[PDB]
Subunit: 148 residues, 12 copies
């Protein structure tokens, strides 16, 4: 099935882009974060970035194992992707809100992959589900700090 | 609130770190992304060894990007390596899709050679100004020099 | 055991039993390929085969223990496994390209049984279906690692 | 930054995974009771197997509960609540290893009924929470076999 | 089983049984606080609460096995634990300060039972008394790690 | 180019080849017993069989690699292994005592090939002899751990 | 003050001999045990032996650190010690009863040490108490098997 | 002598000796801050200080042993260390913000000495200079980890 | 602190504070002996002193934390530790016999403070006494490991 | 037994029994020397004696389990071991030179039984011979590490 | 040091000394090959050579320590090794097929010495013979991993 | 792309590869043949000097190759370029130490020339020589402190 492979690339490719973007912009947030929660938030952002890289890898290799290429060069990723992470120094609350905003957009792509792969490829569906479990948990670890 | 003591403060020294280490952060972080690209898309008779070597190049580039970034931040200056900025400052020969292992190694040596030029500029440019930052540039150059050899040794014949 | 509706257990045994057989066969024919492989890619491929064999052993265990957990026996004695299974791995020394092609061929027939399990367990037992999806994920990846070597 | 992102999915998780948390967390406490009080010819093997069923159950409780909380709804698993929502066949004092296994298997059978119900209820609603129920069911099914296999003769 | 100064066994049961119920309740109620905690200190307190629960589970096991090893049973079923124990941990989401104050409250009540075990075992069984001491040193330290956060 | 006794290697391959078939069959038939074992000693015997299987796989690997190191191929495909090998392990569920007797029976047959290799290799290749001696030391030990269970 | 060191030697020396003897006699039971429970009991006896060796060390090193020699040559140890462990093959139930009987006699010496050291050296009494905790738990793990 | 160059050795003692004292005093005063710290960031700051202390101990060792390797003694007795150093760390309980400022002040004093060492050793002994540069990289990072909390 | 006994906190501070000063001083002076030791046993004694310093550091921590857990602060600033403590460890290079003698001397003065804590906490707080017993067991053993070298 | 042979098992017991006794005795006598050793090489000899003890315990276990795997009991009760064995290790404190000489003397007596086993098993059971050779190889190395200290 | 029989020690030196010289040279020449290897298989062969080197270093050590344990010296100074040993490893960069051919030639020469040691120790000292047997197993296996690459 | 930089670096680091790789071999020699009252400690410390020396050899040789130049470190070249004071047979630990310290002293001469001469050529290769020199100076001290007596 050329269509099973076509459908994974269509649904999983946005996932590789946003997860690979989260690695880079996540490291930006980790470097520049300031303020009274520094060390916890600096470490937490490092763990989200490690997760993001593992997820980009799982999704990318699921596409490639099906026999289709992935274009995830820097130029392409920057084209398909954007970020609320500030350019410079920012308070820990602001870094959190910026990363949650990047995570929310990745969640919309994970859910679209989950619904889109239901009637086509349960194995590729399972990859988006496993990623969404981890990203939902990261989103909570981050956002619970602002709950009040 | 600016790192390094003895004299005050010094805005000069921080400003040189940012100037020479910033292109390093951007090229090393680009090499993480483009190296993963090469890692996913590589094909042909040397697949598993080159697939694995590229992962280890990426893991090094990521460490180097962090050490350079944190050295800039420790001196009290921000760093801009958002995806958008990094894309503007950086370019790759890694192909868009599948490619034979020889071609991937050439594309990645080309991107490493661009980083080397910026490391050698940092080493020269920091020599008169901040030996501690210079050491960061030196340490990353040794690792990058070795990764380059591991890549290039495959093409000797 | 139990009033634990007997048709769920029977569907796992029917769809996962071929996975146990072909995965356990892959352990043995993979060791064969690992011992007897030759040529310019020897070390990497000898290593990669050992890793496919380790995966195949784990997948066989996982599928078999799912059947037995649901209360049914499994026959994968050597004699049953040999009746139910066949291999393209050569008898003796062979070049790495040839070993890879033979292993990918065995992997391709296991993938057939994995997808039949996935499709067949969908309206019956989602827990057992997840065992097959998990194995299929790993097998698809092992197949790409092997097959990428022949890509030109 | 909303915190609960889909109230509907959140509610479905709370509805179907809350009994899973209660029974797994109760299984930690009553599994320990069986581990402490077990006697007879199979002591050391069963004492150790019960410890591993307890460690699983603690992880399953944690995974289930954090799935509900991540989605934005709280969980009440205080001791008083857990005790009102749960019961156990584990004996109050010393018991032979066969009776401990029967009692622990009866507790796991009631959790499998709640896991299957979660699997069924999450199917049209949230496949990501369904996957959490499916992962737990696989491990609990395995533990049930390990225990029950001792009684097969 | 087989000895057995019923006396020393009785003292252990009298004094360590409340320690088992309170430590085992702290595992359950500490997990409740770990799940539901919110606020600017979330990650550190979520993690510290896990570490308290891990300690409390080891202390319950040590105190319970000390009683059983001496030859008396322990009734630590959920229904009995719920009858013997009470918690201030809230039913839902709560700010990290409130979770700390609730958990320090539950720890303060265990400390009263730990001190009564240490005094009560003193003339009776120094080996059971050492169990109560070892537990109290860890609980005292956990109480400080929690309470230090509120010192201002 | 350059030396060696192809005679030595051929004689040695013929002594070790039976070892490889029986060891590799014991992996498959041991897993079979591991999955299907039942009764009052389940968890201990299930675990011990897993360790018997891991040793057998190491032994098959050590013997096969010895043969290949000497320059000779080895045919351990499933089809060949089934022709040369048989098992007393039952087709389905079996009481632990019977699983131990069946596995000991398979071990006993392997020990006949091992002893023949140790005796015959004494005059052929002391290096290959040492492989058989090491495999036999472990197998003699697994047999006692299994069998000591029926001593009463 | 010689009196502290003399009390330690006096009370801890029997503990060294009996723990050291339990290493040897427990190895004897570990090698020769037979029966339905072989593997569990074979492994449990190894674990008793490892504890016994650790305890004999800790007690001996306490005596020596206080300045006094210890004589636990084989010959001394055997004049001072006896065993119920059978000379050959024995069912697992009989090995357990013989090892528990050797443990019971070590318990009598441990309790005498705890009582004897109470008014004299609390630091050496802590050694006896820590060993008794461990031995009481080993005793239960053995005997629980015959509870029936 | 025990030399080498008398001059080179002397330069290293001269420039690295202050570095040994300030690092070794930071162990001691960092532990102080670690024990006595309070307030809403307690756990994270309590852990952070322990890691600064573990680094300062390592830096003290590295610098001292560089001096001794070159054949010169080092006097880092408590009494000497106390004459040659001073601390802003409070005597008792303090809020985490104040411990951070006290520690960063002790660190800025040490950075002054590290920089004079890097400047003074440039012409004389580049091996010892590298010791000071390695330490200064670590200490600069430790300073940032602390001071970042007050940027607020 | 707590809702109860001021005498418990005060006795712990009274008896364990000297122990913190002496153990923390032994970290500093032990490192001095470690760096400056010479002669035929260099490497064995260099290593042993590092292990003595690691223990002293852990003991200093355990005793300080016990005090703070009970609600009282501790002043182990360098300045204070210097006022309350002395050393026989020499200023520069010394033979290993004289480093062992100096370290033993510092350890004997610690043991006097530990035995005074043991005796003084006996009627006040058995949990705090247990801390002092545990440190004394370890320090007594370090003392023997060192002094046994001079039994020559 | 197997379908195999009783005069093999009898040989093993005959040649390996005195090994089990002497190695197990070296455990106890080795501990005795490790406790009581004094003088300028204390820590290095203390630690060396512990490693010899650890090897001796493993060697006893390997010899004993070989005998038992063959189907024969082993009597290594304290009383039997004490009967079959003697030591030159002193009752009390002794200089490290004397402890080395006493231990090497116990080792030489074991080497005599190890050599008789190697010669005696040569025509009877090459598998048990291999156990004797493996033990002798370790014992020969331990002896060298001890004796090298007295060479001058 | 010492030993029993001067003849045993003398045969060990005579037959194992050449093994020590060849293994030790293969560490040095193996490293040369590992530094200078080029071509399509660089990383696999670079890593494979490093593991051949690590094995050779261990075999050198084992053989040399066996000689010394029996009481005789070994002269393995660089000048001696160089007089006793030669290599076909090239001086400079070389393709991986050519590094493999050179290393395999150096191993072939060591295998001649090993087989001479095994034959020559057979009537003299089964313990030292077992050392040459174990080395020869490992080296025959390294030889295969190298040469398999050239089968095509 | 300056070939003279790499060649100059190779020329400074090559004697370091030879002397370090010889110390591996002659250190093993001392580690096997050492006797006397401090046997176990010195036998062990010599094994750690050897493990360091092998690392230093590797790091220096691989910097040369990374620069694109071959290194000739065959046994025959190493023996032509190197000498040792380690005795041929059994020797007391004090004599093994003096011989090894003498080999180290000759290596420090080469490390110091590399450090001085790489200062104007290649700071990255200089840094390799400084790192090896820091480790070797520590091993020198660990050995020699036993004779300070
Ligand atoms: Fe569906
Ligand atoms: Fe337990
Ligand atoms: Fe023979
Ligand atoms: Fe008292
Ligand atoms: Fe032989
Ligand atoms: Fe300069």
């Amino acid at each position: 099935d050329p269509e099973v492979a076509a459908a994974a690339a269509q649904f999983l490719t946005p996932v590789v882009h946003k997860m690979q973007a989260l690695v880079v912009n996540g490291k930006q947030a980790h470097w520049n974060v300031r303020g009274s929660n520094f060390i916890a938030i600096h470490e937490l952002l490092d763990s989200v970035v490690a997760h993001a890289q593992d997820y980009a890898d799982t999704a990318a290799e699921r596409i490639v194992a099906l026999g289709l290429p992935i274009d995830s060069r820097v130029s392409t990723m920057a084209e398909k992707t954007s970020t609320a992470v500030p350019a410079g120094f920012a308070q820990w609350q602001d870094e959190i809100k910026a990363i949650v905003s990047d995570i929310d957009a990745a969640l919309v792509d994970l859910q679209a992959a989950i619904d889109g792969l239901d009637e086509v490829d349960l194995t590729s569906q399972d990859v988006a589900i496993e990623i969404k479990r981890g990203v939902d948990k990261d989103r909570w670890f981050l956002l619970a700090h602002l709950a009040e």
